[PDB]
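Hi D.,

Good news: the full-assembly prediction came through. Inputs first.
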Amino acid sequence: ASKVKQDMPPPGGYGPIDYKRNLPRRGLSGYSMFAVGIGTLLFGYWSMMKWNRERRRLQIEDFEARIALMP
Amino acid sequence: KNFSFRIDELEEMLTNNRIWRNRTVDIGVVTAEDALNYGFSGVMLRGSGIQWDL
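Then the structure:
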């Protein structure tokens, strides 16, 4: 009547099983990374140049007010 | 069918990490002749270039 029934793989077997190492490269050349670093450094230098010159002018103004008040 | 990604994550945390490499590279170097004469087996052999697997 009944037939044999035990744990077996399904007909045709199972699907493929990945085992190879997969460490993909995100990707950015050393030249590009160094260029981005240098570019942001240059932008910061320019911004600080303008701001510190403005600060010098403000300090000179404050010094002038003090000089006017001294006598 | 999902374990290879776990091994990949392990490798991403360890394989190319410079702290890990500085902790492991050139540590406990054993020659093939010493590995054989000292009774080693398994990876302790195969890490030294001996081609052996039971």
